[PDB]
Ligand binder design. Structure first.
Ligand SMILES: Nc1ncnc2c1ncn2[C@@H]1O[C@H](COP(=O)(O)OP(=O)(O)O)[C@@H](O)[C@H]1O
Ligand SMILES: Nc1ncnc2c1ncn2[C@@H]1O[C@H](COP(=O)(O)OP(=O)(O)O)[C@@H](O)[C@H]1O
Ligand SMILES: Nc1ncnc2c1ncn2[C@@H]1O[C@H](COP(=O)(O)OP(=O)(O)O)[C@@H](O)[C@H]1O
Ligand SMILES: Nc1ncnc2c1ncn2[C@@H]1O[C@H](COP(=O)(O)OP(=O)(O)O)[C@@H](O)[C@H]1O
Ligand SMILES: Nc1ncnc2c1ncn2[C@@H]1O[C@H](COP(=O)(O)OP(=O)(O)O)[C@@H](O)[C@H]1O
Ligand SMILES: Nc1ncnc2c1ncn2[C@@H]1O[C@H](COP(=O)(O)OP(=O)(O)O)[C@@H](O)[C@H]1O
Lengths: 151, 151, 151, 151, 151, 151
C-alpha cells in the first residue's frame, strides 16, 4: 500500500457551490483513505503562513481575503503517491488549463475562484497538515478493501 | 428560511464502504446548509450517553461496540424541518423497510449495519449536537442560494 | 404507445440552483419524448393567465413576482400517462411531503421555492401548452428506442 | 449475513436502452453480492418454463415472444432478504405503479416493456436459478466489506 | 466575470440517444450561465449558412442532411473563455481523438455522429448566435453564485 | 459502422470494490454493443495461457494467484475501434499514469490492483475472446440506436 499523506482543502467557493460531497466522493472512489476532516472558518494568520511562499505576489492579499471570506473543509487523505496524484485529480492551478475529468476542469472557471487547494509536495503537505490539523484530530484505521487496493 | 439544526452521523460502516461523499451530496443538493463536520474515532462514554434511551435493550452493548469499532463522521445540518425531513431522507431504522431513494434503502441491508444515524427530534438533536460538537466547531454563514431556497 | 403530452416548467430557483440538466435527465431516462423546450423570462400577464385559478389565494402576490424575477425552462413531454406520472416524478407540491427519489424530494425544501411545475390534468396541460408555446415550436419525431419503450 | 439468493433478469428492452450497468450498480451499491452473471438469447422453451405459472394469462404468448426477441442479462444475487428487497428495488409490475427511486419507476413506462424481472419468492427464485444456471456457473467468494454489511 | 458567449448545439443523435440533460448538466456544473435554449428542426438553408465555411468539403452535403434529419437543441452559454473551454469540454471533432471526461470522449464513437457542435471562435460563435436566435430570445439574469465563480 | 470486437475483463479487485456496473455503464454510454458477458473464477491454466507472454517477468507468480483469488467479469464489446478506444477509456496500465476520466484514473491506485484488463490489439483480443468465451456465448443483435451511432 502506502501510508503517505496529503492536505487537501475545499476553498469557500466549493462549499458555497455545493461541491463537498462530490469532491470527497472522488477521493473515496479512487481508493484513498480519509484520515482527517474538518469544517472550519479559517484565520488570516493560518492562511498567511500557508501561503507564505507567495508573499511576493500581487494576488496574495486578495487570495487571503477570498480564503478568509467563508468556511473551508480541511482534509487529510492517505495513499500511494497521494500528494502527486491528488494534484492530477485537481487539475491545473488555472481551471482554463485543467482537463475535463478533473475537479477544477469539471467544476470551475477562473484562477481566483478555483474551489480547491492541494499540497504541492510531501514536505508542503506535512507542513500544511500540521499547520491545519492537530495530531489528536487525525484518525487511523484500516480499509476493509485495503488488500484489493494494494498488493 | 429556517435556522433549525440536526445532528447526522455516518456510522463506521458508511466510512468503510465509501459512502461519505455520497451521503453529504444528498444533503447539499437538497438545500440544507453544512454547519459542522468532524471525522472522529468516537468513545464509549460519548456513545452510551447518546444511546441512553436504549440502555434497556438487548442490542445496546453490541450497538456501542459496533459504533466504537471505527471512525465516524459527525455532522450538523441547518434548514426548514431538517430534523424531520432528514429522517425521511435516511429512510426507516431497518434498511429492509427503507424505500428506494433513501440513503439506507439505496446503500445498506441489515438493521445492525445501517450506515447512518439521524436526530429523532429537535430536543434530541440539540442534546446530540452539544454532546458531539463544541460551539467553537459550529460554523455560521449564508448560502449564496438562500433566497432561491427560501421565500 | 401513446401521444399524451404534459407541460413541465422549471422555475427560476430551479435554474439558479443549476438543476436544469438533472431534471431533463430524469424525463429522458424514463423514456418520455422531448417535444418542446424554451428558455424565457415569463411576462406577468402570462403568469397571471397561467396561475389564474389561484388569484383569490394569499400567496398569489409574491408568486407572480418571483416567477417573473428570473428565467424559466418551459417544456413539453410526450408519452403514456405523462401527465399523471410526470407529477409523481416531481413529487408532492410541498417538498416536505415529497418522497426521496422525486425531483422536489431530492432537490428542494420549501413550497414557495419548489423548483418545478407540472400540469395537474390532461386538460390543464393542453391549456398550459397553448399558453406557453406556439404550435410550430412543438417538434414531431420518433424515438429510435420506441419499440423498446412501448409494445 | 445471509446466503439467500434471488434471480434477476434484465429484459431485452433494458439491454437495448443501455441500463445494464445502471441496474448492476444499484444491486452492488445496496451491498448485495453478485453470484451469477450471463448474457444470452433465451429460448422459447426456457421462457415458457420460466413463466409456467402464467401460461393461462392473456399476455403470456406476447411476453414469451418479447422476451425471446433480443438478449437478456441473467443474474444471481445473494444477501439477507434479497428476494423481497430485490423486488422492492425493481418497483411494481407496472411502471406507472412504481415509485421514483425504483428501477422501473426511474427507467421505464409500460407494463409490457418493464426492463427487468425478479423472483417473487424464495422458492420461485431458486427454481429460476436452477433453470437458467448450472451450479458450477455460480461463483462463491466473500465480500471484503462483509463484516461492515452484516453484524 | 465575463460576458463572452458561445453557441452549442446538441445534434440529432444526441437528442435521440438521451444526452440532452447530461450535456446541459456539464455546462451548468462547470459554472457557465445558460442564456438561450431552444428545440427545433433546423432547415437546410439555416444549416447551409451555419456551415458555410465548409461548403467545399466532401462531408458537407451529408452533414447538412444528417443535421436536418431530426431535431436539435440550440443553446447559448456565457462565461470567461466559454468558447474555448466549451470546445475543450466537447472534445475533438473526432470522438476517437476525444479524451475520457469530454462529452464526445464519453458518449460517442464516430465523427459523422459526434452528438454536439460548439463555436470554434468568438467571432464564429456570435455569428452562430445571431443566426439561430433573435436577441429577444436571449435571457439576461445574474447567477446567485456569481461572486463565488468569479473574483 | 464496424464489427470490430475487443475483450475486456474486470479483475477481482474491480468486483470486490463494487465497480462492475460503473464500468459496464462506461462502455454502454459510449455506444459500444455488449456481445459477451460472463462471471467466473478463472482457472490457473487459463490465466497462464492468457498471460503467457509475461511468464519470464517477476510479477507473474503473484499475478496468476491474485487473478485466481476471486471472480472476474469477462466481456466482449463491439464497435468501431473498440480495441484501441477501449484501452483509452481504461487508461494507462499503471494507474499513476492514468488520467482522470479514465476507469483506472478514477477508481484505482497501484498497478498490481489495476481493476481491469483490455486487449492490446485486434489480434490479442480475438485470441483472448477464443480463450475466455465459447463461440455460442457471443450474442448477435442490432442496437436500436445503431443509425444514430454510425453513419
Ligand atoms: N494569477 C492568480 N490570480 C489570482 N489568484 C491566484 C493566481 N495564481 C494563484 N492564485 C491563487 O493562489 C493559490 C496558490 O497558488 P499556487 O501555489 O501557485 O498554485 P496551487 O494552488 O495549484 O498550488 C491558487 O490555488 C489560487 O487560489
Ligand atoms: N433490533 C436491532 N438490532 C440491532 N441494532 C439495532 C436494532 N434496533 C436499533 N438498532 C441500532 O440502534 C440505533 C438506534 O435505534 P433507534 O433509536 O430505535 O432508531 P434510529 O437509529 O432510527 O433513531 C439504530 O440506528 C441501530 O444502529
Ligand atoms: N402556501 C403557499 N405559499 C407559497 N407558495 C405556494 C403555497 N402553496 C402553493 N404555492 C405555489 O403555487 C404553485 C401552485 O399551487 P398548486 O397548484 O396547489 O400546486 P401545483 O403547482 O403542484 O399544482 C405551487 O407550485 C407552489 O410553488
Ligand atoms: N398486463 C400485461 N401486459 C403485458 N405484459 C405483462 C402484463 N402483466 C405482466 N406482464 C409481463 O409479465 C411479466 C411477469 O408478470 P408477473 O409475474 O405478474 O409480474 P412480476 O414480473 O412482477 O413477477 C412482467 O414482468 C411483465 O413484463
Ligand atoms: N470526415 C468527416 N466525416 C463526416 N462528418 C464530418 C467529418 N469531419 C467533420 N464532420 C462533421 O462536420 C462538423 C463540423 O466540422 P468542423 O467544423 O471541422 O469540426 P467542429 O464541429 O469541431 O468545428 C463536425 O462537428 C462533424 O459532425
Ligand atoms: N510491475 C508490476 N507489478 C505488478 N503487476 C504488474 C506490473 N506490471 C504489470 N502488472 C500487471 O500485469 C498486467 C499485464 O501487464 P501489461 O500487459 O504490461 O499491461 P496491460 O494489461 O495494460 O496490457 C497488468 O494489467 C497489470 O495488472
Amino acid at each position: 500500500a502506502n501510508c503517505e499523506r496529503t492536505f487537501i482543502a475545499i476553498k469557500p467557493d466549493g462549499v458555497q457551490r455545493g461541491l463537498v460531497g462530490e469532491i470527497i466522493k472522488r477521493f473515496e472512489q479512487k481508493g484513498f483513505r480519509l484520515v482527517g476532516l474538518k469544517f472550519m472558518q479559517a484565520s488570516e494568520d493560518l492562511l498567511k503562513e500557508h501561503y507564505v511562499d507567495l508573499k511576493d505576489r500581487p494576488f496574495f492579499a486578495g487570495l487571503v481575503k477570498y480564503m478568509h471570506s467563508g468556511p473551508v473543509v480541511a482534509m487529510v487523505w492517505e495513499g500511494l503517491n497521494v500528494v502527486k496524484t491528488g494534484r492530477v485529480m485537481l487539475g491545473e492551478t488555472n481551471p482554463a488549463d485543467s482537463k475535463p475529468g478533473t475537479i477544477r476542469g469539471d467544476f470551475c472557471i477562473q484562477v481566483g475562484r478555483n474551489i480547491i487547494h492541494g499540497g504541492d509536495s510531501v514536505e508542503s503537505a506535512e507542513k500544511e497538515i500540521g499547520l491545519w490539523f492537530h495530531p489528536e484530530e487525525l484518525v487511523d484505521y484500516t480499509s476493509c478493501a485495503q488488500n484489493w487496493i494494494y498488493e
